[PDB]
Amino acid sequence: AIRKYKPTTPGRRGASVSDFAEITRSTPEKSLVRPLHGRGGRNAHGRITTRHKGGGHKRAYRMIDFRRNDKDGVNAKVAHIEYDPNRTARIALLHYLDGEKRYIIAPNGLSQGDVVESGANADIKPGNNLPLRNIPAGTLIHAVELRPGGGAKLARSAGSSIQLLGKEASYASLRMPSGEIRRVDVRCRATVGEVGNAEQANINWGKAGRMRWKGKRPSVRGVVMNPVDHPHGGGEGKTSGGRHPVSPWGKPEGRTRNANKSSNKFIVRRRR
Amino acid sequence: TKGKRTFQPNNRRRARVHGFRLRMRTRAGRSIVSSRRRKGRRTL
């Protein structure tokens, strides 16, 4: 699924690309597309709050249904599998039998033209969105919501999946692809299956310019900065940074999760 | 940047950056306009 360019040039020596073999209809569905402009990592203040962003290809936002709440019982047909610049997963254009047009994250094994069910009575097939109550323990799921009706937020990048670990009383315990065991409410809904495009992590971008196309801007190491710019800066030759590694803002490496965050009650075991 | 000087005139940008309405939109700007009236500047 990954096609490697030949070393016809130093920028393509080890480079690779997705063969896009799963994609049909290289254009997006017009009614389902909304505009999107780059921010350069700038917030409302106009200042860089996320470094290393900017440039990058112009993009259009497709609306993905991370809810799948309002069409329980009405069936959908996977009309198309299509590129989406906004995520690493591919997207699936579903035609609902009531005539509604929808985009969803494309799981493994939802080739064009097959049927997706939603609701408590849905079959346990890749792409079917059900409550965790009706999803049995042990199956691989994705696009699972943290709160009932809040929309999918968990395991929705390419190749990601939760497995449902168990359901004791009213909370489903589940292993998050970070390896973290978390409990969510059983009425949180998830779509059955791994997220597709699982092989895109193997893409070797060949050159700097390609990451510039994807919108990443050059990152400068703190150790080649001056002391005024970075705690690691300074030194006559090259140094290791004259101190324990810290961020550009002097923050030491270490746990940054709020130790008294309210979600600790649902987090069962932190990642390894 | 060879040969290009610092002041490249553009009257619309002059007005939108230093203009009367820009001045009047903030207290500092109104303070400046009143200070220039008080000094007696012809141009405000």
Next chain:
RNA sequence: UCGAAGGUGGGAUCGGCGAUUGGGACGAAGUCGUAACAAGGUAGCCGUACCGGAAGGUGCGGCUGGAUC
């Protein structure tokens, strides 16, 4: 026109020497161990991998050209 010799050039190929370096063989009554031959003192060998001054050690699989019931 063809033409030997000659000239120019880049290759091919066969040799010599070469600071330095590597192993081999044969030598002596040298130094360090004792790896194999007995269950050789941890059975030994084969391939492979890693490690160790050195023989060697260990892992994985295999063999009996070893054992045990």
Next chain:
RNA sequence: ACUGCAGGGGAGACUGGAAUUCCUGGUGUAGCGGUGGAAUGCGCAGAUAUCAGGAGGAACACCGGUGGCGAAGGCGGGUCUCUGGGCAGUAACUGACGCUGAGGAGCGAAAGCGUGGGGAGCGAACAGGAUUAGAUACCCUGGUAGUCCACGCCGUAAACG
């Protein structure tokens, strides 16, 4: 060709239980572990032990054999799907179409290599303990690669009857 026959022959998917390890809790207290003897180590912050639940990986006890199958290497938890070979019988068919095979091609234990997963237990390297004159070992305590999976590469074994 037809009728039968035996089989761990192969591949894929799903799946079962014992056991080890770890986690959560219950009990419970000062040992546990290990050895030729110890120590390193684990525990007293609650270990070992014991009960319940759970996670995960690997291998499939009893059947099991001296046996069966496969060209060899090798092959067994179960089920399903696909699939190769072999043996017997009838004499229906072809009518020497056979044998071998330089080169060549494919398959080829284990180790190893690449990428991506996985990682219980074991365990090269490594580290400590012990033994010892020394101990780069054998023994102990840990333990990384690896062992497992997918796909390639390697193409070697006392690949032996």
Next chain:
RNA sequence: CAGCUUGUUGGUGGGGUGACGGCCUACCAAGGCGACGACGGGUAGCCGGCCUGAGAGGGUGUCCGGCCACACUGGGACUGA
């Protein structure tokens, strides 16, 4: 030493030779050799014979005799059967 061959393989019309012949030439087609070893590298004059051996073989090619090649090294014509 696994790819060697372009006048190379063949044909036509010519030329040329004592004579056939790519021997040479114009044109046309794209063939010829090779694992039975092409092409290449090394070595070598070959033979009846001589030495040895029971023979088959092995070594060798000196006297004699036969054949070939050469004549300081390399290239070319002349006369003349």
Next chain:
RNA sequence: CUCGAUGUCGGCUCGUCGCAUCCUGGGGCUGGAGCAGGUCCCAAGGGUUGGGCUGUUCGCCCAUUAAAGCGGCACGCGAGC
């Protein structure tokens, strides 16, 4: 002395001066037979090479030469490079 500035090494260019003389010139002594030298004295008129290495000065080396002198002049000379 100079900090309200006296530009630092080497090279180049141009020099100029001293003699403690490298050559050429004149001599004494010699452990000067001759050829060559050694040493000292007098002598500054002229001459006193081109390269390799090094930023170099210096130095070593190559090839020469009658000889390949030593020093000063803001370690002469950047309002000359």
Next chain:
RNA sequence: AAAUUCCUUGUCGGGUAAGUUCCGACCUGCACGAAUGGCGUAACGACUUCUCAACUGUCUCAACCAUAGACUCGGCGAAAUUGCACUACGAGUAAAGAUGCUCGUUACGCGCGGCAGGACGAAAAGACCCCGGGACCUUCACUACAACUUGGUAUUGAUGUGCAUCUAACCUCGAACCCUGAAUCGGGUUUAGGGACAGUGCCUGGCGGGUAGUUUAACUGGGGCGGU
């Protein structure tokens, strides 16, 4: 023997007539070494470095030509600088390098084109150095503070046995509805959760070059180092 080797032009070999540079090694590594990566590496380099061919005025060693200036004439017409001035040289002397002082020597007055030795020429109140001040930078200098974090207490309640449960405070960027005509804002209502927790106030410990203000002596045959 290195972008690292002081000794050092180490030693051996190669390249040159001759090689402190270069290449290959030796290992005696002043002071290499594995992601401040180690060792290699095809391709790439207006990088650094060494060699060869070609080529040439780079050079031996210069010559000539044209043009723009320079020069002359006419027109216009600045500048830095400037204590003066009918501003020699030698040997001296002197704040120790003299146009200006001494003793001599030399020199008719004035222009023009050139040169650049001096006027310690001009230019910038020396960047070096030291002293005083400052700035910024660093940190296990000092003292603070932000941020982060701890507990008490208020917000903050009920029931049982700190623990658990509850819901009503409070919280929700979960959902629906309404203001709303246009609203991914906001607010309200309902619901679904969380929940006396969290957050916040006051008090409090910690941490804190993230930030800030500062200090960091003097003597000294310059300062530093050493010593005092």
Next chain:
RNA sequence: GCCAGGCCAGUCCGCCCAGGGUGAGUCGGGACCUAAGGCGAGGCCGACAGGCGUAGUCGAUGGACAACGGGUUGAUAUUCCCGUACCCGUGUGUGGGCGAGCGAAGGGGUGACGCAGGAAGGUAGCCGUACCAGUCAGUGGUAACACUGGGGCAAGCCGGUAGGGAGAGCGAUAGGCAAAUCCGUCGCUCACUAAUCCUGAGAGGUGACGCAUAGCCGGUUGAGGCGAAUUCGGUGAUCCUCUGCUGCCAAGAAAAGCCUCUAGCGAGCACACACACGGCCCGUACCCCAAACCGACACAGGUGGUCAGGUAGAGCAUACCAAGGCGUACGAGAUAACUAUGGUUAAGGAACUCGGCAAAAUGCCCCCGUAACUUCGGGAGAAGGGGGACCGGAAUAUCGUGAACACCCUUGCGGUGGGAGCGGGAUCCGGUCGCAGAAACCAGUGAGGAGCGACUGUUUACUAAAAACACAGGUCCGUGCGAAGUCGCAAGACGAUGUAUACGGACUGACGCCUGCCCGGUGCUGGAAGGUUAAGAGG
């Protein structure tokens, strides 16, 4: 006008003075639309100041939107005038038709979009040419189609070519906030191998019985008046078909507008033609690789976009020219040194020098040929060679491009052949000339060995372009989601309309082989048995 200014002078002038001059329904903007962003009713947040932001409203560099050709002034012209158009709106008549018709809330569709690359059909332009009109240049020749000039014309409208675009209906309808006959989804019949409809470059007609033009007669050489021919080829776009087609991954605005639906409005309407009218505001002069802009200057600098012909050329290089500009503002002399910019140089050829710095050299097209090494792509234009001009012949169809008179067939911008003239390229053979055939201008030096950095890139504007930075790749750490991190006192925002194959931070820096030992110190992570301890409580 000339006393300042203009680097001199000045009668001149972008200087001084006065007067004059800029004409739009269609051009560029507004009255239309929105992007980024700005402001922002209420609002949320914040001691105050204020921050942010919803509705909304602005905001072109983009979307939509109706005009062309010629003439004229001293100065404006797609603006004035002429000729011919097109767009929006208004009123009045006539004719016949329908009692439908309008629907702009909202829905839906469209609008609507990247990069790269052609090909084909064309066109502009250009080069010739039929034809037309002028000229006879006292030089050796040259009286005609030799030479010189011409060999033109739009928007609009009509017809509709090549090429492209499409299945057509019927029914249901859980979706598009209400509705929908629209859209979406689903289902069924016909045909498909076909016809039909739409769009439709170019070409044709009309515009044009007009305009323009070479030129001619007379002419303060002003202004006039007249005014020919305009055909057929070649070549050929940076333009059109083409918002197409193909390929690719990095996956490529919005809104209005337009169409359609229904909600709604509706007793009157739609439509045609004729006439008569209304079309607003702002800009419009002049300068624009500049003497009028940014550089204090009439300053060797900078300044976005459009057009941009000929010959040679691959070319928008270059050389010389066209159209069109200009000689641009100190001059005149003069063989000084010297400086600068160029040029040439015997013999030698790096001996120069820190260093081949600079210069020289190489240089083009085609054909041969091309090493170590390699990551199999490269290295490579490796290196190293050969040919190159003109003339003639091959050469009537040599060849390949484009495709006319006159013959044949489903009647057409149609087809079969046919080959004229017009261009292109290559070869071979012969000859000719020079010192030289790449002709001038233009236009790679090459090879070998190290170090560093893999590479393209980036950097100290104004002494450093590198070995520095970045980079793809690697690893570690953080982060379970208004995440972590960051900006903010907060609200809020970015992160991200992302969700661990993700995001942030750190170090390393393609790729290959690898990455050993140490957890003592200091950090970080986890643990909580005990010691220590603040406020609080206590008293």
Next chain:
RNA sequence: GCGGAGUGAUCUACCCAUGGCCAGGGUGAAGCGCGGGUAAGACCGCGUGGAGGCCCGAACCCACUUAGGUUGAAGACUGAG
């Protein structure tokens, strides 16, 4: 130099939205076809195709070297590369 309050991104740094521009040569990736090869493939040869922080090279953007300028034509330029 320190503080308070303001002014500046018409230069420059980065980013955002929306436009524009890049003569002419060259190389020849994927893919796609045909053929060979075997049973089928691998794979190979031809075409086609036109990729690439690809090559040469104008505009354009830079600023490596060098000479000139250095009271400049210019407070950073010019010539040649």
Next chain:
RNA sequence: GCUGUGAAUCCGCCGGGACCACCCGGUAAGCCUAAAUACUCCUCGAUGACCGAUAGCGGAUUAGUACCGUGAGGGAAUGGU
């Protein structure tokens, strides 16, 4: 002033410089209140052992003008027959 806790209504409460007793003084947690005080952009009227055009206002004069700066800002010179 903020945080916590949190009264009492005269046989109360507050002050008298920790605090206690006595004594003295006063009635917090509501508001309003002239005059004497401060100031002069501006209007009149005077004044000066004040200035007299480089002074006096920056400004006798185009004066916050010209000019400089993107901007905030800076900011002249010039009188006499």
